[PDB]
Amino acid sequence: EELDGEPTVTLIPGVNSKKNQMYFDWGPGEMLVCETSFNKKEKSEMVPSCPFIYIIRKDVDVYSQILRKLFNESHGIFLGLQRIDEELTGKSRKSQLVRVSKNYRSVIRACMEEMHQVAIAAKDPANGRQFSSQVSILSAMELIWNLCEILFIEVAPAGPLLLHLLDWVRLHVCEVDSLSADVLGSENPSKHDSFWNLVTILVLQGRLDEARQMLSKEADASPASAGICRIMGDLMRTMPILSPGNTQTLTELELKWQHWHEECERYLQDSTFATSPHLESLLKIMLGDEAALLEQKELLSNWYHFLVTRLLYSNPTVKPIDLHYYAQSSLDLFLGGESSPEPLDNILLAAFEFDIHQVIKECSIALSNWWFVAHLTDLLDHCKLLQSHNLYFGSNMREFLLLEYASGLFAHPSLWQLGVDYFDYCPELGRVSLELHIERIPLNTEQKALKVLRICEQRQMTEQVRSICKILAMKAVRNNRLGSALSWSIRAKDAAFATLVSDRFLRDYCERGCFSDLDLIDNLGPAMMLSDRLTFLGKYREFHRMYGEKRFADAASLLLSLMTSRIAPRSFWMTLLTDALPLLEQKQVIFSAEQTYELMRCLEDLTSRRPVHGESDTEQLQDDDIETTKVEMLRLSLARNLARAIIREGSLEGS
Amino acid sequence: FVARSIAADHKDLIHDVSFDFHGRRMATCSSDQSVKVWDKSESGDWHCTASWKTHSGSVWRVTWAHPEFGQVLASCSFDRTAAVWEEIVGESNDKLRGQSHWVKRTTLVDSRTSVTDVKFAPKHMGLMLATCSADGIVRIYEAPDVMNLSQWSLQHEISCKLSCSCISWNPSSSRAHSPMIAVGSDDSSPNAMAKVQIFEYNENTRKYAKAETLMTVTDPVHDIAFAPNLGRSFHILAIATKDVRIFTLKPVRKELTSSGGPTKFEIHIVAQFDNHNSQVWRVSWNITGTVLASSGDDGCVRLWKANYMDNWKCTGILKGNGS
Amino acid sequence: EEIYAKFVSQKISKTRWRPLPPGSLQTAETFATGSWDNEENYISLWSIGDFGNLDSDGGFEGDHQLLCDIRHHGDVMDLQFFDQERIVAASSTGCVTVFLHHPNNQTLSVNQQWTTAHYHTGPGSPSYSSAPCTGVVCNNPEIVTVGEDGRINLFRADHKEAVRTIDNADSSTLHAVTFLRTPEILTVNSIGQLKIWDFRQQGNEPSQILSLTGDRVPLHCVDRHPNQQHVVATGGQDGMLSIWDVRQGTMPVSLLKAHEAEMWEVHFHPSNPEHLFTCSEDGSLWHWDASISSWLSTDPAKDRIEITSLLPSRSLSVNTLDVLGPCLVCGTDAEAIYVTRHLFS
Amino acid sequence: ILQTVRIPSQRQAIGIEVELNEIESRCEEYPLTRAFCQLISTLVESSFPSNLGAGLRPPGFDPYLQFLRDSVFLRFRTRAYRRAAEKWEVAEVVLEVFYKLLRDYEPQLEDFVDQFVELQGEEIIAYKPPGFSLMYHLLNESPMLELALSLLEEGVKQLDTYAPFPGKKHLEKAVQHCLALLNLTLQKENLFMDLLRESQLALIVCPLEQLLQGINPRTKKADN
Secondary structure (H helix, E strand, O other), X not given: OOXXXXXXXXXXXXXXXXXXXXXXXXXXXXXXXXXXXXXXXOOOOOOOOOOEEEEEEOOOOOOOOOHXXXXXXXXXXHHOOOOOOOOOOOOHHHHHHHHHHHHHHHHHHHHXXXXXXXXXXOOOHHHHHHHHHHHHHHHHHHHHHHHHHHHHHOOOOOOHHHHHHHHHHHOOOOHHHHHHHHHHHOOOHHHOOOHHHHHHHHHHOOOHHHHHHHHHHHHHHOOOOHHHHXXXXXXXXXXXXXXXXOOXXXXXXXXXXXXXXXXXXXHHXXXXXXXXXXXXXXHHHHOOOHHHHXXXXXXXXXXXXHHHHHHHHHOOOOOHHHHHHHHHHHHHHHHOOOOOOOHHHHHHHHHHOOOHHHHHHHHHHHOOOOHHHHHHHHXXXXXXXXXXXXXXXXXXXXXXXXXXXXXXXXXXXXOHHHHHHHHHOOOOOHHHHHHHHHHHOOOOOHHHHHHHHHHHHXXXXXXXXXXXXXXXXXXXHHOOOHHHHHHHHHHHOOHHHHHXXXXXXXXXXXXXXXXXXXXXXXXXXXXXHHOHHHHHHHHHHHHOOOOOOOOOXXXXXXXXXXXXXXXXXXXXXXXXXXXXXHHHOOOOOOOOHXXXXXXXXXXXXXXXXXXXXXXXXXXXXXXHHHHHHXXXXXXXXXXXXXXXXXXXXXXXXXX | OEEEEEEOOOOOOEEEEEEOOOOOEEEEEEOOOEEEEEEEOOOOOEEEEEEEEOOOOOEEEEEEOOHHHOOEEEEEEOOOOEEEEEEOOOOOOHHHOOOOOEEEEEEEOOOOOOEEEEEEOOHHHOOEEEEEEOOOXXXXXXOOOOOOOOOOEEEEEEEOOOOOOXXXXXXXXXXXXXXXXXXXXXXXXXXXXXXXXXXXXXXXXXXXXXXXXXXXXXXXXXXXXXXXXXXXXXXXEEEEOOOEEEEEEEEOOOOOOOOOOOOOEEEEEEEEEOOOOOOEEEEEEOOOOOEEEEXXXXXXXXXXXXXXXXXXXXXXXXXXXXX | OOOEEEEOOOEEEEEEEOOOOOOOOOOOOEEEEEEEOOOOOEEEEEEOOOOOOOOOOOOOOOOOEEEEEEEOOOOOOOEEXXXXXXXXXXXXXXXXXXXXXXXXXXXXXXXXXXOOOOXXXXXXXXXXXXXXXXXXXXXXXXXXXXXXXXXEEEEEOOOOOOOEEEOOOOOOOXXXXXXXXXXXXXXXXXXXXXXXXXXXXXXXXXXXEEEOOOOXXXXXXXXXXXXXXXXXXXXXXXXXXXXXXXXXXXXXXXXXXXXXXXXXXXXXXXXXXXXXXXXXXXXXXXXXXXXXXXXXXXXXXXXXXXXXXXXXXXXXXXXXXXXXOOEEEEEEOOOEEEEEOOXXX | OEOOOOOOOOOOOOEHHHHHHXXXXXXXXXXXXXXXXXXHHHHOOOOOOOOXXXXXXXXXXXXXXXXXXXHHHHHOOOXXXXXXXXXXXXXXXXXXXXXXXXXXXXXXXXXXXXXXEEEOOXXXXXOOOHHHHHHHOOOXXXXXXXXXXXXXXXXXXXXXXXXXXXXXHHHHHHHHHHHHHHHHHHOOHHHHHHHHHHHOOOOOOOOHHHHOOOOXXXXXXXXX
């Protein structure tokens, strides 16, 4: 089971929950909230409160201004991970995945100590505590990642596992080197009150030639202890520690360490150190005395340093397959049964039990940002370690985590492109999670919208391509940018929108005597055919590309073809009839007798469908003065061309 | 959750808030008879760009169309009307000083009683608009032109036979589910044994046939929401009542013999939550339908999510401090 | 040699080198960038880190140092230096802004601004709508800009208003603009055309039009050979590179495949112009060497153009480049910048 | 007729620096440029005044050399030619001008001192003489030295076919003046380098003996 605590409590300023109800709605990274109170003055002089709206942005911590570094530098490493070949052998690939792990650690570290300097530079102690809190979260992340790297990615074998776990503690328990600088900077280092604490803590970190050099400042200052301090110091040189460049067995290390233990215990029986109880404690610590190690608890800042100390001095041939028993037994002895473990202890214990899924679960409860769990879970799929379990909604555990991190990248103005990469590697629900976000990217420029269209076109998201192209055609139509409007309705392939933009251009013609573009109507090519009305626009432009292009009878037969088409709007048939007047009353017969019959038919397919209705209103008469004049000039010119045509054509049937 | 705040300067109680499709604009409506539109700057601020009287009653909702239909708003009212509004570019008539560039294109007037909710359809159904009212009817309207937004047909009166308080369209773009609408009821009568009803468009009759009725929702309903469909073979439906409820609705595969009738559903309650200790007044889903939000008389918005085992739990509480 | 990448936690839409003093012997020491798609966009001045030293205490001082910044309004659609202290930027707000560097202080400031240079109109009221300003080109004292409104403006760095405007020079978006000769510009558009304009002519109409044959390939970018005012290079929506002689017909002289995507900038080398560079939405950046000029051969299977991918893997989109002497810089959607001091080694 | 004074409000050049790039570069025929180079080619052998341009600009010749160097010579290979010979007819008459300017010049110590002059109240440095401008652009890895060494390579490249070609005699002369300019640098370099060492000037220059061993960016050998 999971989520058995209190649900995460945000406090909203001013808002008076103590009786007042709320309304709300969801945007891409921000939810709105509004309160049901309005303060209609019971006689008090005070300003009445208006209602207030609140913009409540997602807790996934993406808006700490430093962590933008963490997200981009880790996305560069994630594309450095999804571009690794699977046939890269289990030594090349394993070394490369250990580099990918150490690259991610380097980014956590390079965000953490930048934020540490920002916490020191914080000119208010409230802000310094906010940065110090996020430094502690990045420290916990690099602590857990340094362990998961040793156990699951580098997979440290018995022997080297103890070397890995010693510098694992050391690269985070940095308290010791800070204390070393203050003790060594003093006029007499062997007489700083913390000197013996530091000598012990260096032995608890296994730093034995560093502890020997601190013990040398007692030997230089104290010619009474110096002889015994140098027996302790040379036992701190005979300890069998594993050396990676050294061709020995574990059973050689083991048998040599057993002699060293029998030699250290020999000096305890002869009471060699019973003249300085600090050196008597160091011998018990170096012998793995679990009572003397717990007497050092005020020098062991955590239970996992106590565990690694207990492995160094009681089990130098420890294996991964033994390790849970020591981890639990060290947590038991460090907490004593009157304290419970903290969420970090539960994560680190589950890592020492090697349950990757309990580790992923408690990291998903203790950490406010999916970022950590996403990159760690994906790197453990690159190591092929995960249980491939489908969930009740089909998708797998890696996918369920990556979908919520992608639903954190799409919650930001810039990071949505990185959210597309994080949706493509999600096989059950990734594409559908992308298809619900992709249309909601703010399309400020046509150039931005081309990148979003290209992303949909690559992925065959055809209905989202039509959507975005119609949103762009509608951006253009509300701004009357008819060339973008027609080019975007052509990329949408919406024939109703292509007709609608044509039924702007044909009115834009009536409102001027000319179009707002010509090149856009000539260069229609095959896309002219996206509707009948776009073909009429293209071919009426082409009539205006015959009459001006040194030709006429071709233009006249195209004009009659436009009119006899079931496409030409009848509110423009009076125009196409008027466009025939400069061709009919020419000295040459341009239309034949039978072409002149069909032009007259089109005048009656306008005129002899007028209704006979009467008596309102006086306004109207002024264009019927003109319509009757239009119609009589057409009757007269058509009759004149018909008479000239019959005489010309009837003299070519019998000569 | 990081909270920025805005003084809304509505001169009475706000009843609703709604984002645009991109989350770059928001609308809010009030008992002062106004709607306001607020736009999100490229600096990360927000500014009130329009603020006008919409109606003669208290305004009970506000909603946006999908942007392939432009910049269109709908609002419903206690005067028994709904109104459709368009943002026009370059139309601000100085002759009439202090009107909005948000022009009213039409007013729908057919409801005999207060129009309680209004929702545009999923865009793959065209420019359709649903309203509901306390006459116990849902009305579905259609614009046959996206430019002449003055002209709207009335295609359906749906008789719920109980007062209507809220409506939700099913957001399934998949041609394997028919158009569906769920309807809630404010009815306090003990005689009406169920307060949620679900209707399916049956093409063979061109009518919204009643498919289902939620016989476990005996208590009054204030709000209702279908969850956005991540490919699921079953729908999810959130309801606001005396408690929060989450239902699954899984279509029963018709055998090749049950002709002409609606679909039937395998229906479950997956969750029921009392934790508001009070009535629930809104339910809205995140963009992917994985997280529900709901409000109540506790002065908390509460967030609810499925875990990896489909155990729905509360995950967060957004509450005022009054400092 | 190696190319020094830097993360900056803003997407970089544009990068430009600071113009060297006439008769200096320095390399390009300073560059400017502009950003896009953030919650806050900026214009920033940078110095190239000095990869030649270690001091005694072992720090890596070789990072590209931020000299100073200023916040922008909208997105930095295009960017150019006007002299050694002034920079001009376009905006997705339709604004055009001139800035000034203050070397004695390390700051930027505004110098002059045209908040309504580009805008969409509507029927009958001056309630203007924002139209993205897409490209800017300078010819001191003179400045030209284009946009989604299909407007051409001519501005000046001593004048507050437009010196000339041409509304509806296209019914589609204009993408980029360059000076052929001082009163004479060339623009590119959503249709796949090059339109030439002479500010001496008293109509608003183009002096000449060029295009591809029939198929609409939007042309996003343009440059014009430093020693040949008639030779022009343009980049397509498809990833083609087109070389034109604007005196010889209506078509390109040479047509080359450069990318698998939209080509965002093309530039000739400012001193070595038989060399060319291009960037794209395929995440690649290419160098081209061709040493009649080789760019005007109709047979690129005889006359050699040798072609080198400068980036060692495809990033997110490479929106921009600039090249000055041996130095080259580019900017990306991976919230990162790439620099070399050496391109001929 | 060459604009040697460029005004801070002026978008266009004026004179042959327009007519070359607007008219001759349109025609692909270059009579105005070659006659203007032939004009300067006489006027150096009758000497130029040291006070040339004084009171309108800094005194001296370098504005005319900037035009021949950066507007004519470094552009003679980028331009197209209707006469495939005229590519070499332009090449003769510009290298002749440089040859005469380096022949009649002799290095002096004041060449390595910045001499100031009063112009409208500003204290401005006078232009260095044309032979020192040529030496500085010939004792560095300049575009001028690139175009000169890639002429000596190109001359042999045409002559090893033994063939006739249109304009051959003017290419043979363009190679001639290109060689003669190197041999004048070698016969004047030690004095120019030692006067630079006595005058302590903040310049850097490399021996031509060693720049001739630069890696030719065409052939990618030291083959100069």
